[PDB]
Design a protein around this ligand. Structure first.
Ligand code: SAH
Ligand code: SAH
Lengths: 445, 451
């Protein structure tokens, strides 16, 4: 222990920042978020300070550092580019026993500012003694990804409720198991954040009526197309809380590596009815169920079918969208789905029968899902229905993954090019495909 | 934020604890480890306070509270079981502008003491503000299984190298590139943990020897439609490490709160497009890691292509992190799947604002078995209704408008196609128009809110 972390209550307390440039602006922003009664003293100010001053948010004192400005101070920050001024600030603060930070000199004064993860009233702070700002930031990034955005809502609502939980639960063992379920109920958190009382109270005494061991729900989570970094923050959080993860072939190994160590896994890679009942069966055993699907759940994912099974049974559900194959393949192949006036619309199409005259019309970007089989037919029909034979085409196999393959050419070679790839692959047809020679940044295989 | 966390240097600074029971003993142990010059003022003391004052580790003042004991103090802790005494302490500390903790009353006084995870010199502090003692410990447990124990040795070694890093790398940019390699070298971490000095030195000399890439970079990052939970892990990594973030009005405040606190930020909401291109170009040429943070997905009606197409000729590295486009986010959060069973053979993402005297291909857009999603089409909703009808879309085709989709302020209105124009007057931008049979599924699949 070389530093003692404390969480200061600054609301309406006088604090002083010396300095008026970009560094001081960042510290002022932070102290204002904490409700400090802030004075800023500097020889000159960048315009953000005059804005705040004109909105009554702080006081400005233009001129040399005046150590009487510390007279009723609780905290001081020296944020100038002048070592001599910063040392004058820290000496004047030290003689008054005012905790003081010198931004460019962590061992020069009496406190250092840690990296902060804010879920107020819940807060986390990280500091390596000031000798590793990159390390503290790498930890902040991990923590920001793991703490749900609305955790603070549930933290505050916990107090509004501590009495009722003591009278329905006698032992401290059951009370702890109640808090465990309460704080990971992200649905209650989101309902609190939405200010939706009908949803809030519907979730609340469902927590008091259900037995403590029951936590039955289904979350559909979009895994994205392959790259584990394309999972959403909320997707990661949900798969870290699942009792049971139901997945298939199109969820990548990298994503599955993120699944919490002791979750049960069920591989359904199998008619849809079997899958719908698996989710129902697992949810009615009272378990927190995540159905992980490749890409986005509601784009040729049959996610709607999985959810109507559950609405029937009174099982709570939610959906976390994911990066669909079109978006992932577009970004990683350097083929934007729109560009300038090239396309008035993007068409996401599955390979009843397709309306070929419609697909052939000009000023579209066509994106075929599950169309490898019909790729010879697609070429033949588009040409017969008037698409210019020189229309650029591309096929992206295993888009966003470390084995992504991109082959490209013109419409007359589509059935040719399709044999060079296997599923999962996308076919993109449109003038945007010509941009790849300028926008290609990801390694090809 | 409720509180500002700070990490205080207490070495040789006077602190006062009032009270002498088990609570006071726990706080005194903490202050003593931090190097505080400690006085403890109490009517009675439990035995542990006798062992400490025998070894000269603190000063005991046996008796009622003496507020003059605060006169030279930097921190005060009120740890009696007498609320009247605790409040006299906190009043006396407040008059002296001394940060003061009242252990049994976290909402009183002026600082709270967090739970600590110790990987010294690395430290992680957690508190819920006293609103919930339980949540802190549940979080504390998770964070300990997350932070390897040898993280302290990595941090310790970094502190030792800091002078040499500062001497050999003249700019903050070069130093940052070194540290980013240092802190993810798993072999160095293992050698430190094993006290293998030859292996430490071999990897260290190689790290110092590596030529650094002084080129900047432009990364286009899809922020998603608003809910900060819908940023990708890679997009969070990019904004947590950017030098400068160029962003616009359709990037939500919650996502902006995830940006590196130290990054410069340039707002280009209403800046013309060719000037955005120049900002990214010149900032990357200056060697900075630039993030262009865009609403939704960068390559769907986001002009991301225009922002990139100068860069390869300029020899400036770039990449793209895709994001959740408005269609996908609004779909999920409104209960309206974009595809379902035989309802749609395709999803059409259409712009409702055209350049020139441009006309959409209404005959093509009116076809059956599709879900139409119009972006920036609010001003055109009356025209969209009339044209779709005139080219034969059924008059009772369901429609929906999602305003601020995925945000806590999201609003959804719905009806049939002959109501589209009037429905659009009920929302404001940003809003998506969804046209198609899948809109009827909302009453079954809507989970997010009814506002
Ligand atoms: N990584 C990937 N690269 C290219 N195409 C992919 C892909 N992952 C899925 N696909 C496409 O998606 C089809 C499965 S249908 C499932 C689509 C998914 N819900 C999504 O939103 O993307 C595959 O046949 C293939 O055409
Ligand atoms: N949160 C949101 N809710 C509803 N519509 C949104 C939205 N965010 C963006 N939009 C739509 O997107 C249009 C801007 S065009 C930029 C779209 C972005 N690249 C994307 O992929 O989503 C807006 O006019 C509005 O129609």
């Amino acid at each position: 222990m070389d530093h003692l972390p404390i969480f200061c209550q600054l609301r309406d307390r006088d604090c002083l920042i010396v300095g008026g440039g970009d560094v001081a602006e960042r510290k002022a922003r932070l102290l204002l978020e904490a409700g400090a009664r802030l004075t800023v003293n500097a020889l000159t100010f960048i315009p953000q300070f005059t804005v705040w001053a004109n909105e009554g948010m702080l006081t400005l004192v233009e001129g040399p550092f005046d150590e009487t400005l510390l007279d009723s101070c609780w905290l001081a920050i020296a944020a100038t580019d002048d070592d001599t001024v910063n040392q004058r600030v820290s000496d004047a603060a030290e003689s008054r026993r005012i905790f003081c930070n010198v931004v460019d000199a962590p061992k020069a004064a009496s406190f250092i500012m840690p990296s902060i993860i804010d879920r107020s009233p819940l807060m986390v702070a990280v500091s390596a003694g000031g000798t590793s700002h990159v390390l503290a930031r790498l930890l902040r990034e991990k923590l920001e990804s793991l703490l749900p955005q609305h955790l603070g809502q549930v933290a505050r609502y916990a107090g509004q409720l501590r009495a009722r939980v003591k009278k329905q639960f006698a032992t401290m063992g059951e009370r702890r198991r109640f808090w465990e379920k309460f704080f990971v109920n992200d649905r209650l958190a989101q309902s609190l954040a939405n200010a939706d009382e009908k949803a809030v109270n519907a979730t609340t005494e469902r927590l008091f009526s259900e037995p403590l061991d029951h936590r039955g729900e289904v979350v559909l989570v979009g895994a994205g197309p392959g790259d584990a970094g394309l999972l959403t923050l909320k997707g990661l959080q949900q798969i870290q809380q699942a009792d049971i993860v139901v997945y298939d072939r199109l969820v990548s190994d990298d994503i599955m590596n993120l699944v919490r160590r002791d979750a049960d896994r069920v591989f359904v890679g199998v008619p849809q009815e079997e899958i719908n009942q698996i989710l129902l069966r697992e949810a009615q055993k009272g378990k927190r169920v995540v159905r992980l699907k490749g890409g986005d759940p509601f784009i040729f994912g049959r996610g709607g079918e999985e959810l109507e099974t559950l609405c029937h049974a009174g099982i709570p559900f939610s959906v976390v969208p994911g990066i669909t194959a079109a978006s992932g393949c577009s970004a990683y192949s350097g083929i934007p789905l729109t560009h300038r006036d090239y396309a008035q619309s993007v068409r996401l199409v599955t390979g009843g029968e397709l309306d070929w005259e419609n697909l052939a019309a000009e000023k579209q970007t066509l994106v075929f899902y599950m169309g490898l089989n019909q790729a010879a037919t697609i070429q033949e029909k588009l040409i017969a229905f008037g698409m210019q034979a020189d229309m650029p085409v591309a096929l992206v196999e295993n888009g966003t993954s470390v084995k992504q393959r991109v082959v490209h050419g013109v419409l007359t070679q589509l059935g040719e090019l399709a044999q060079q790839v296997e599923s999962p692959a996308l076919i993109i047809v449109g003038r945007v495909v010509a941009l790849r020679d300028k926008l290609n940044w990801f390694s090809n295989h």
